């Protein structure tokens, strides 16, 4: 019954894991020094929680999953495995090798069925098999009732969900990052608890952000370019870096998963949908979607996010390829730090004073008999940018206290125009909600195409030879 995770025994992330999963008990057991250990521990516990609340003897659709992970599970899985990625061949070869080595040593795991399923598919690519297929989400023609997504950011959420509901699916799950920073139209950000940094294509040559690179120079007073520019706005291309692995993503598909509370799917058949958040821990969320046939209720087109920790978004100045520009950066702040800062933001503080006080509140020296250790609450490299945000916030709130307006009227006079004030910092305190306007009515989903066999003969021969032995 104990659940074992690959976390160091002295890590401070263990306490956060326990409060997020109070129905389990977690014991650390480290076997490898992976650079993204925290990002994998959460995913492991999420799968265990889902399987505990799913009715048994029911088939499950797993979209875009490596089949080597669902081998020892006692449930029924149908893996959809297209071959449009650069690391698919390794996963397929590893799955075949592990399957062959497991034959004859495991009593009841349906190993023989899996072996027969793989051989049948390799003979005819277009065949359909209960445990394996090479179609896409909109091409698979196998009926089920539960669908599971895991770290998928390459599909359109309304279009993909509609095709699943046609086959008769009434439940779905999603595991991944938090979409809220991308709804604010930010340029760069970071998730410090999981050692993840993301940035835009146009700021990859910055100097003082999480993910950048530059070089030394002397500085010249003249240089000409054919691009006038004069406009720095976010684009559709975004780079992700989790640990030491790179992932290219797109903004349009990321924002499509910020579903509203209630929405309708209208087409040949009609459905009514909902969306809830069950687990949230410092950036990772788990979502549950229910689908029913018919058309009921009314829609409002609003999305609500609940903040347990502080959320910051400020404006910074940096040099990109030698030129000084300005953009926006977002991050997360622990709740304990935010509560202890309430006293000093009642006055005006310079950035230097804020930085010094934050350092004192963060670092402590701990002695255990004769050993000495230094302990930190949050990562140190984000302190300078955070200190700037508090200084600006404390100044904007004061100005509202002298220019007091009348109650119930709008000031609009020499000309009938109203002045718009400047804003440089958005700060969301703990126990505060944010609301956004999105779309709730979806009509067109027609995306016809032709299916092409994504496989090669050299790969087919290698798999067949590997799956050739008397057991």
């Amino acid at each position: 019954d104990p659940v074992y995770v690959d976390i160091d025994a002295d890590s401070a992330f263990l306490k956060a894991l326990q409060r997020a999963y109070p129905m389990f008990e977690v014991e650390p057991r480290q076997v490898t020094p992976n650079d993204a250990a925290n990002a994998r521990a959460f995913s492991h516990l999420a799968i265990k929680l889902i399987e505990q609340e799913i009715d048994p003897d029911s088939t499950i659709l797993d979209i875009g999953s490596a089949p080597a992970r669902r081998m020892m599970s006692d449930r029924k899985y149908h893996c959809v495995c297209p071959m449009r990625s650069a690391e698919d061949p390794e996963r397929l070869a590893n799955y075949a090798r592990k399957l062959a080595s497991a034959a004859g040593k495991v009593l009841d795991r349906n190993i023989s069925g899996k072996i027969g399923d793989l051989q049948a598919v390799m003979a005819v690519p277009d065949t359909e098999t209960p445990t394996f297929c090479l179609h896409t989400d909109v091409s698979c023609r196998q009926r089920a009732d539960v669908a599971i997504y895991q770290d998928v950011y390459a599909v359109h959420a309304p279009t993909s969900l509609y095709h699943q509901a046609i086959k008769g699916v009434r439940l779905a799950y999603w595991v991944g990052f938090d979409t809220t920073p991308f709804m604010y139209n930010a340029m760069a950000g970071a998730y410090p608890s999981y050692s993840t940094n993301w940035a835009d294509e146009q700021v990859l040559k910055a100097k003082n952000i999480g993910l950048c690179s530059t070089d030394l120079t002397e500085g010249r007073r003249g240089k000409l370019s054919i691009m006038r520019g004069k406009k720095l706005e976010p684009c559709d291309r975004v780079l992700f870096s989790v640990g030491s692995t790179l992932y290219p993503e797109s903004r349009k598909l990321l924002k499509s998963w910020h579903l509203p509370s209630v929405f309708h799917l209208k087409g040949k058949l009609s459905f009514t949908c909902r969306c809830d958040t069950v687990v949230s821990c410092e950036g990772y969320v788990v979502k549950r979607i229910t689908m029913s046939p018919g058309l009921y209720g009314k829609t409002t087109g609003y999305a609500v996010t609940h903040h347990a920790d502080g959320f910051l978004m400020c404006k910074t100045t940096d040099t990109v390829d030698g030129e000084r520009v300005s953009f926006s950066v977002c991050t997360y702040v622990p709740a304990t730090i935010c509560d202890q800062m309430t006293g000093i933001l009642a006055t005006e503080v310079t950035p230097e004073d804020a930085q010094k006080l934050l350092v004192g509140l963060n670092q402590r020296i701990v002695v255990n008999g004769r050993t000495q250790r230094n302990t930190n609450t949050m990562k140190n490299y984000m302190i300078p940018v955070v200190a700037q945000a508090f200084s600006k916030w404390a100044k904007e709130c004061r100005k509202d206290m002298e220019d007091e307006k009348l109650l119930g009227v709008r000031e609009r006079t020499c000309l009938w125009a109203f002045k718009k004030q400047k804003t440089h910092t958005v700060y969301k305190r703990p126990d505060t909600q944010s609301i956004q306007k999105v779309q709730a009515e979806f009509d067109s989903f027609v995306v016809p195409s032709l299916w092409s066999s994504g496989l090669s003969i050299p790969l087919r021969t290698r798999i067949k030879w590997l799956l050739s032995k008397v057991p």
């Binding site: 002695v367 255990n368 008999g369 004769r370």
Partner: protein
Amino acid sequence: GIIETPRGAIKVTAQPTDHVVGEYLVLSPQTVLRSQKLSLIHALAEQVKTCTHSGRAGRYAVEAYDGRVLVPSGYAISPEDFQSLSESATMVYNEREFVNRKLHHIAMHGPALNTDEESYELVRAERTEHEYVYDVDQRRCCKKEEAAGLVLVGDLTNPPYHEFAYEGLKIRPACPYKIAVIGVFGVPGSGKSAIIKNLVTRQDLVTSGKKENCQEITTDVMRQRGLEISARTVDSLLLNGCNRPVDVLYVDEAFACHSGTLLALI
């Protein structure tokens, strides 16, 4: 529990099912003080006190040290014998963990450099030429049970004499024996040695005094007169089980030993 005092004499019943060794009751020093019935041994309660804390963490880290008081139970004895019997049993119980903590303290922290603690080293759990060796996982003295981690050795680790007395309380008598206890006074080695040397009986056993004193009488009787008297020692007689009762007992130099130990020995 309750303590009954039948007509002056004091006897204790062992109805509580708490930690008891042999026929001796174990209770906290604070319990003894808060009882007018046990006012006869309140002095020992004060002495065993000043040795009860609940550990500490930080720069100066220690472990919890708990002491207990041992009293005989189940037998109707004189009130005077109750005082001496408690002292002997209690002292042995407090002595055993005093050494145990010292060995455990060396393991976790660093041994002192300008001391004698370098005679204690950390040794692999496999190469264990030591017949009895002290372990850290369960903080006892054990012969061979695969002590995980890294095992400690030392000087007193070789014979665990402190551990050889914990089980002795299991067979420790409680009821004093009634017999005409006579004694010879004055500087020894004049006639009292000769009582057990030249005119000792057949069934008497020379177990008294130090191991050298036990053997000298045996060599003295055989060389001078004979009579085939064997030789055991006080430590072995008290620890190991006894045999056929001695006809007449001629213990010498027993006034060095504690009175309560003699009461159980007889």
